[PDB]
Protein: Spike glycoprotein,Fibritin
Amino acid sequence: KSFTVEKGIYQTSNFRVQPTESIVRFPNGSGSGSSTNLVKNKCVNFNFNGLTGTGVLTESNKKFLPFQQFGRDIADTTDAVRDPQTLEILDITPCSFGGVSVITPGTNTSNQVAVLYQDVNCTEVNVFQTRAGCLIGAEHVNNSYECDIPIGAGICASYQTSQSIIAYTMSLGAENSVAYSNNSIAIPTNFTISV
Amino acid sequence: TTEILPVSMTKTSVDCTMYICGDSTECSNLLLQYGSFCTQLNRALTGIAVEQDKNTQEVFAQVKQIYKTPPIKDFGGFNFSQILPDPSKPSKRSPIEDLLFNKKFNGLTVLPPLLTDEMIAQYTSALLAGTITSGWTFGAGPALQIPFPMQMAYRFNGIGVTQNVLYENQKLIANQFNSAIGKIQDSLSSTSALGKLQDVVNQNAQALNTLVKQLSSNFGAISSVLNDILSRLDPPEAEVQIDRLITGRLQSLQTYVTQQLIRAAEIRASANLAATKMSECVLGQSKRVDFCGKGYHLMSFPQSAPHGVVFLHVTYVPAQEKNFTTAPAICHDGKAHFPREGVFVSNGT
Amino acid sequence: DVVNQNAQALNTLVKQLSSNFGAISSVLNDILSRLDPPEAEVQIDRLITGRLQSLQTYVTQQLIRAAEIRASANLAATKMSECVLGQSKRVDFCGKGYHLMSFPQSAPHGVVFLHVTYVPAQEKNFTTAPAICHDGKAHFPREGVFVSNGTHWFVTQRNFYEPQIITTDNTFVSGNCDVVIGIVNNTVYDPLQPELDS
Structure:
C-alpha cells in the first residue's frame, strides 16, 4: 500500500502449478464410462473409479495388498492409487505450489528486482536453485560478502556492481588466527573510551 | 555440568487460501466477505519467522571475527578434543555436537533458517577458539593471547583462590577437567538429556498435526469435502455449507496463530536468556551464584544443537572440608590484628 | 516496530468493520431498513459475531504485546538499576568493552542508554612466565603478570602495559622452584636491603 519500497524481501503472491489435462480411468471392462490414457510425471486432474483429485502421478514402490485399492497418508489424504486396468501403484504428489517473494533494493536506488519462488524447482516455472527455492533475476557470485538481504539457507542477495542484484553465500566475518603459544602474552599499551 | 536452552523454532508459513478453500474459486469469493484475516495471519507468521532468525543471530553471532585454534594442541595438559571440531568429519562438528544432533501439503510450508547448521558450527568454533586462546579478552576488545595455564590461574583468582594453587596442582586439575569432559560425553551418549528443547519440537509438531486434522471435521456441515458440497447442492445451500466450513477452518487457523505467537514469545525469552549466558558465562567469568552451574564458575564452552544451544559449565567445587578453631582477631601487644584476606585458624596448638 | 505494530493492529480492527462476514451488507442501518425483524435479526447476529470475533482477536494480540513490552520494561529497569546507578561487571550487559558508566535519555515510549566503556586499543607481544625463582623460592605476582621484552623481566597490570621492577612487595612467595612448570630464574629486588646497607 505504498508508492515507495524499502530494501528487503517481500512476500507478494502465491505460485501454483496448474493441471495440464484430466485423466479418467476405469477397469478393463466398462466402469460406466470411457477411460483415458494414463499420464505420468505431470500435474493432471485424475479420476480413478470415482476417486477424484489433482496431482502428479508417479510410479510407486509401495506394495498394496490384493484387496487394497487406495492408499492414505498419516493425515488420511490420498497418497497413492492402484490403476484399475493395469495393477500398478501410482503415487500422487500435490502439484507444486509455494510463495512468491520479491527481492528489491530500495526504490530510491533502482527499480531492478529479483523473484524468489519458495520451495519449488524452477524447471517447473540468471536462474539459481537454492534450498530456499529458485531465484530468478539474480546473478550467482562465488565471492562471499556480508548478508545484505537474507534469502535463506545461508544465501543472501545485494545490489552490487553495471549494477545488478547478486546472490551469494553470506560471510560470517573476517578470519583471524590467534598467535597462541605457551609463553607469549599480548598486553594493551593504549586504550579508547567508547560510547 | 550441561545446560540446554532452546533458541528458535520451525519457521512455518500457511497459505490460508489453500488451507480453507483449496481449489475453489467460489469458496475464495466467500472468503473475501470475511475481510483481511488472511493478510493478518500471514503477517503474524512472517513476523514469527523473522524473530526466529533474529533469535539465532543474537545467541550465536556475538563474535566479531572467526578465530581458529593453533595447529599445535599444547594447552598445558588440557584436552579439548571432545569439544573442538573434528577436522576429518565433512561437517566440522565436535563429538559432543555429533551426539547432540544424533539424538502436510494443505498450504503448509517450512522456510529454511537463514543460518545453516554449518554456519552455527562455525560460530561455535570461533567462540571456542577465542575462549581457549585469549580468555575473555576477545569479548571486550582486541583478542589478546595468553597461555591457557595462566588463564586458568586468573580464573582461580576470580573465585578467591590464590593462583599458586593452580600452578602447584596443574596436572591434577588437567586430569580432573579431562575426566569431567569424558563423563559429559558418556552421559550424553547414554542419556532424555535434551529436555525443554524436545518439548518445544513436540509442541510444534502437535500443533501442526492438530491444524491438519481439523480439516477433516465438519463443524456441523453435511460433509468435510468442499467439492462434495459443491457438486451435491445448489448454490443457495452450498454457500451456507461452505460458509460453515469456512468459519470452522478460519477459527482453527486463528487458534493456531495465537498459540504460535505465545510460543514465539516464550522462545524469545529463552533466546534472550541464552544470549545473556553466552555473554556473561562464555565471554567472561560470572560471579552470579548458580547462574553457570553449581560451584564457583571457572568458564564455559558453547555447543550447537538442533534449534538450541548447550553450555558446558566448568566450575570449582570444594571437596574435603576439615574442622578448625577460629577467632575474629588476635592480640599481640594490646592491638587487635585482623587478616588482610583469609581467616585465623587453629589445629589446637 | 512496536509503534508500527500497534498502528497496524488498530488499522486492521477498523477495516474489519467494512466486511460483511456473509451478511447482505456491512451497514447496520441498511439491514434494519431493508429487512423485516425476523431476517434483520439473523443478519445483525452474523455481523455481531464477526465484529465480536475481531475485537477478541485484537484484545488477545494486545495482551501478548503487553506481556512482551512488560518484559522489555523489566529489562530496561534492570539496566537502569545496574548500569546507571552503578558499575556492572556483567560482560556485554552494558555494551562492548569494560563498563565505566551509563547515561539515560528519554524517548517516545522508550529509554535510551549511552554506555561509556573502556576498550583496550594497542596490544603488544611479550614473553611471560607463571612464576620466578630468586633463592629457590617461587614468587607469584600479587596482581598482574610477569612480562619480558627479551632482556629484562617486569611486573605489569593485566589491562594496561605499565612495567615495574619485580620486588618482594609486588610479589608473594609460595612453595619452591621444583613444582611450577615453566618457572624462570631472575632477581627479586628487596627494598629493605639498601636501607640496611645505608
Summary: The radius of gyration of chain A is 27 Å. DSSP finds no helices and 18 strands in chain A. The interface with chain C takes residues 179, 182-195 of chain A (CB under 8 Å). Residues 108 and 193 of chain A are 37 Å apart (CA to CA).
